[PDB]
Design a protein around this ligand. Structure first.
Ligand code: BOG
Ligand code: BOG
Ligand code: BOG
Ligand code: BOG
Ligand code: BOG
Ligand code: BOG
Ligand code: GSH
Ligand code: GSH
Ligand code: GSH
Lengths: 146, 146, 146
């Protein structure tokens, strides 16, 4: 874990974000049960009848949050890992990771909490900035070692 | 591949799971062709007419299985890789990886096979346990190296 | 970045593909705004009224492209990273990475550009070939080190 100075901070933030995705999965399942809105007939038949194989807007919202997480957190897992080994200034690296972590936690709160626009969109954009920064830094390092 | 004692087992299980996702992709395409249920008008027009740009419940089921795989296997790819370098007891590490592998293969069989509830849900939960375990172990290691 | 001879090429292609996914995300948002097709009521109310919380076929197409990217590029990020450390012939490794990069960029152009079938399907298949190749190579290396 001490293979580079930024790596522990990266691994902490990454793992917290993976756990935060698992929390979204748990919430999704709870909403399905409470709203009786299942995706599969076999599930519905166990939980009250075929009429409960149906869509629900709160379930759909949970799925959108989880999807957006997969669109953003998964690339961070890759970029941040690589970036950690490029010898960034450790404080600058911490700032990239913390901005991503806080932005993404805020995004889920804004999404699942139905907060007014543009709160969710701002949190998304915030969190994408350090990702864009890391991606460009990796591109320069990779290109210059070809 | 021998950078740590758990790494070969991790790479074997991971790669098998990636291949298993590719199998879901292949099945999905076959179901679209057999049910004549395409997502895009350009595809439908090549395969019999515009009426075949339509949804189908078996195609939707395949997509749900693939989505659930992306929600669970992708985090395992990250967590298990990191975990392999944390000096776990090799047998304990094997058990984490094997439980995930067997649970996830069983999940796809249960999902695509339309097995009765709660078989799929149990397989999901089974497989998530080693992921939760690895995530917490990474969190402690990362935190203690800050 | 010089931990193995193939690694710089891998990191270049990977990072370009992550950026290409971000481009799909940007396009998606622009299409939502231009078509006034938002997924959430809070978004619609900010952009003209509740009637604009609605689906749109161009938005749906963008989401399909992004989903297909997550189904294919994310596994490449894992496989290609591992493969880079297995001592492949560097030119052969470059060819795997370049075929994936070109195939995936072509896939997005074909998808978002609504190009006739089977252009998108061919690009998908093209790009999957080096992934299948890397996966099998990893499987043999992992298995033989058990
Ligand atoms: C990582 C998980 C974060 C979960 C954040 C959940 C935020 C829930 O927030 C709640 O949302 C409801 C609308 O959904 C409102 O009616 C409640 O008043 C609000 O507090
Ligand atoms: C859009 C997001 C912009 C992110 C800016 O990112 C910056 O780019 C600079 C120029 O390439 C690099 O020198 C910096 O290291 C990087 O932080
Ligand atoms: C990794 C890929 C696993 C594929 C598992 C496919 C399981 C198919 O299982 C089949 O499903 C049908 C319902 O779909 C049933 O009608 C068949 O009897 C059943 O055998
Ligand atoms: C919910 C899933 C629980 C997974 C338990 O995981 C365990 O947590 C312990 C305490 O943090 C650690 O000491 C162990 O190494 C880990 O296996
Ligand atoms: C990485 C991002 C690639 C973006 C490729 C966008 C291709 C857009 O291509 C455009 O698509 C339209 C149909 O959608 C056609 O009407 C236009 O004539 C065509 O040029
Ligand atoms: C289906 C896609 C096939 C990809 C072929 O991949 C090849 O497989 C060989 C045999 O395992 C390996 O020896 C090669 O290194 C690998 O390139
Ligand atoms: N797939 C996204 C791409 C753009 C994006 O990620 N937008 C942010 C800021 S508006 C978001 O939170 N989107 C909501 C979502 O993905 O459901 C979308 O459909 O909106
Ligand atoms: N996205 C999931 C989150 C919870 C989850 O993964 N549940 C498991 C056990 S019931 C599952 O197999 N879900 C089916 C699915 O994701 O389609 C869902 O909508 O259910
Ligand atoms: N999830 C895919 C699995 C198969 C696949 O990836 N097919 C390629 C070639 S036809 C594709 O471009 N699919 C379009 C898509 O995923 O929307 C699907 O539903 O088609």
């Amino acid at each position: 874990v001490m293979s580079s100075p930024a790596l522990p901070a990266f691994l902490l933030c990454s793992t917290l974000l993976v756990i935060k995705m698992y929390v979204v999965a748990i919430i999704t399942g709870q909403v399905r049960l409470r709203k009786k809105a299942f995706a599969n007939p076999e599930d519905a038949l166990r939980h009250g009848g075929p009429q409960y194989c149906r869509s629900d807007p709160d379930v759909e919202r949970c799925l959108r949050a989880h999807r957006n997480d997969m669109e953003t957190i998964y690339p961070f897992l890759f970029l941040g890992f690589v970036y950690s080994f490029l010898g960034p200034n450790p404080f600058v690296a911490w700032m990239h990771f913390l901005v991503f972590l806080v932005g993404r936690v805020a995004h889920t709160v804004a999404y699942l909490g139905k907060l007014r626009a543009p709160i969710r969109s701002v949190t998304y954009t915030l969190a994408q900035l350090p990702c864009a920064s890391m991606a460009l830094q990796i591109l320069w390092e990779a290109a210059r070692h070809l």
